[PDB]
Design a binder for these strands. Structure first.
Ligand SMILES: [K+]
Lengths: 231, 238
RNA sequence: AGCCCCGUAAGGGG
């Protein structure tokens, strides 16, 4: 029950573009085989990188060999890039784990999340850019239950979606440039579940850990909703 | 009919403290109006601000009776010393000539122009009460409901139920920028300070006028819980 | 994140 976030370190002028990255990824999916992956990209010009998250084993085993085979090779992610390395560790945004390990802990009443790219949500046939507890966490829990081994008990789900508040928020909305008339939140938000039982706190820490892989909200396949947990 | 926001230009050092400022204000009401301390919905809002050495305090009144019964005492404070936490001398009592001073009427809140958009600046920490817990994210419904509720409470008109639905259920966020800051109440919490542009899509012009009115009302009523302490001070921007 | 009270339980008052 492995999960993986593979970082492609890129050599080339310019920066990767979401439509190119997604289309390029879809090519590999056609060749090689709710979304069980997510995409991202980041860094500055000349120090850019792309990332592929894989949320189910079938996909890791299918795609990972195929990302490795591109080391040293030139791909198009908008502009042309030389993939200098495929990283599973040694990059802040690269990692590998298992589902059970998401439940490591320690359990905490608080969950600090950094939103590294514009995050928004589909709601009432509209894109909403505010990182409200219930959105962040329903989104995370929906995917974790979809690809993980556990279904949250109903009381726990209730606690997370109906009870979690915000302790602190810091940030701003930015344009989502692939979209018409859509903004997304960037910055930091610390969520707090009061009266959290140990189990609830555990589930909350797990959702926080899963965010790093699955990301948060809508159009993660375009690199939106890229998030990670912090101390 | 009338809304008024009077600003006390303060002399002395530091800033007013929330609990001291509210203490001071209920001190003044104890003689004219001891009923309001226990009323679940406040016919007023307090505020303070400024750099240190240029501090000011704010008394906002949402019903005429209080203005009548309170304004004279307030004006009488010119020249004299008040305790708003730290002691200050009251230098002036302004209705005009200060950014947070003003007067208007309820009808005049509704004189447009009506906009599908309402940009609010939250100038002091803004937060809300939900399930015995504090929530500092200014969601469309939380803000507009708190404005609308108090408009209906103290004002001459209630919005049609479809306009209410449009405002509450279908208004969204177009832009948000800011951060939470500490907020001392009877219990310590935090609240949002910064700027949010709200947008009601498919708004009828009526709805669009009610939205602009709520925006205008915010200047006197502030937003959310504990405006009695100076929290939720806000105003509409362009 | 916690006390008291209120509350077509949404949110409010101290
Ligand atoms: K009161």
């Amino acid at each position: 029950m492995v999960l993986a976030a593979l970082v492609l370190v890129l050599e080339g002028e310019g920066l990767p573009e979401p439509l190119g990255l997604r289309g390029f990824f879809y090519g590999l999916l056609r060749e090689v085989a709710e979304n069980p992956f997510a995409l991202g990209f980041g860094g500055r010009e000349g120090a850019a990188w792309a990332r592929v998250s894989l949320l189910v084993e079938g996909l890791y085993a299918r795609l990972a060999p195929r990302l490795y085979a591109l080391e040293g090779e030139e791909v198009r992610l908008g502009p042309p890039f030389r993939v200098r390395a495929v990283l599973q560790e040694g990059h802040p945004w690269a990692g590998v784990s298992t589902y059970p390990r998401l439940f490591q802990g320690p359990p905490s009443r608080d969950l600090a999340l950094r939103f590294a790219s514009p995050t928004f949500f589909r709601r009432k046939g509209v894109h909403y850019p505010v990182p409200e507890p219930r959105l962040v966490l329903e989104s995370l829990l929906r995917r974790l239950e979809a690809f993980g081994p556990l279904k949250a008990p109903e009381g726990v789900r209730e606690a997370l979606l109906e009870r979690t508040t915000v302790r602190s928020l810091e940030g701003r909305t930015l344009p989502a440039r692939t979209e018409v008339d859509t903004a997304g939140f960037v910055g930091r938000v610390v969520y707090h579940l009061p009266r959290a039982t140990e189990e609830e706190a555990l589930w909350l820490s797990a959702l926080g850990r899963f965010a790093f892989y699955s990301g948060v909200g809508a159009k993660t396949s375009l690199g939106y909703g890229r998030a990670r947990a912090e101390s």
